[PDB]
């Protein structure tokens, strides 16, 4: 333990947000910032002007996604793909041999036609040269009424391997909100058991993706991919038995430095992370 003679007390929290805020400002994107991936081709890259994508971590040049790795946990966080990116979005999930895709965008959001959030996983379709196919499977409750619906996408493109992708869709998580630690924990555990089952199938078949640290990474995205996406990722991180001693300061800082200083937007979301870390004897601060 650092030196606060009360790890999860108030002073300890005040200090945590102090360091976090200082980092958010330091990471604040500037016009034509060399650290953040810029928009090329005249096309729209970022869904939000203020929610940028880091440069040296972006998956592909035309998408707002990042290769984030907190401690020993390797995942990929992105924004809800714009229609003009869906074709590229799918090629990433395939090349990645995605063991689990988690969508934390509410059904209501995908519904509102103004938000421009394509319903690309609940229905089948054709996007350019890619031919996807959705299929409904299980439906698991996570408590507090929050529920997850599962689908199985099948990205098929001529001259490429056909990839099946397990999808966990949580449609009752409002925007700018934060589900209780209970739900969150139960949620992180389902994603892990989903990717674990799929990754096994890949190993069994001898795929060469098991030898690449840039593949087989769970892909997660909400709407902007910095709030609800962060809380889930922070929980997955702690759901790992190899990330012992990794503090909350490390979790958040690494997320922000590998994507943008917005990860874990609201405070009600950081708190869910603090409470989970508090029940494991996990440190909040460093040094």
């Amino acid at each position: 333990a650092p030196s606060t003679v009360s790890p999860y007390g108030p002073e300890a929290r005040a200090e945590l947000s102090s360091r976090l805020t200082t980092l958010r400002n330091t990471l604040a994107p500037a016009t034509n910032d060399p650290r953040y991936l810029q928009a090329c081709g005249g096309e729209k890259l970022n869904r939000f002007r203020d929610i940028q994508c880091r440069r040296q971590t972006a998956v592909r040049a035309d998408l707002n996604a990042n290769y984030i790795q907190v401690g020993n946990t390797r995942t990929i966080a992105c924004q809800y793909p714009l229609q003009s990116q869906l074709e590229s979005h799918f090629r990433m999930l395939a090349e990645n041999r995605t063991p689990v895709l988690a969508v934390l965008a509410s059904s209501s959001e995908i519904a509102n036609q103004r938000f421009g959030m394509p319903d690309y996983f609940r229905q089948s379709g054709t996007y350019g040269s890619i031919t996807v196919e959705s299929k409904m499977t299980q439906q698991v409750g996570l408590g507090d009424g929050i529920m997850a619906d599962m689908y199985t996408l099948t990205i098929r493109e001529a001259g490429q391997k056909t990839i099946s992708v397990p999808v966990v869709h949580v449609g009752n998580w409002p925007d700018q909100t934060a589900v209780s630690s209970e739900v969150t924990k139960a949620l992180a555990s389902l994603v892990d058991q989903t990717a674990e089952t799929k990754r096994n199938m890949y190993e069994s078949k001898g795929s060469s993706a098991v030898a690449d640290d840039s593949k087989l990474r769970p892909v997660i995205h909400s709407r902007a991919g910095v709030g609800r996406t962060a809380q889930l990722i922070g929980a997955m991180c702690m759901n790992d038995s190899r990330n012992s001693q990794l503090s909350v300061e490390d979790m958040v800082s690494q997320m922000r430095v590998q994507r943008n200083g917005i990860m874990v937007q609201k405070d009600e979301q950081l708190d869910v992370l603090i409470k989970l870390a508090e029940g494991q004897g996990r440190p909040l601060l460093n040094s």
Binding site: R97, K161, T162, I163, S164, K205, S207
Partner: peptide, 5 residues
């Protein structure tokens, strides 16, 4: 072609 299906 459907190696992993």
């Amino acid at each position: 072609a459907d190696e992993y299906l």
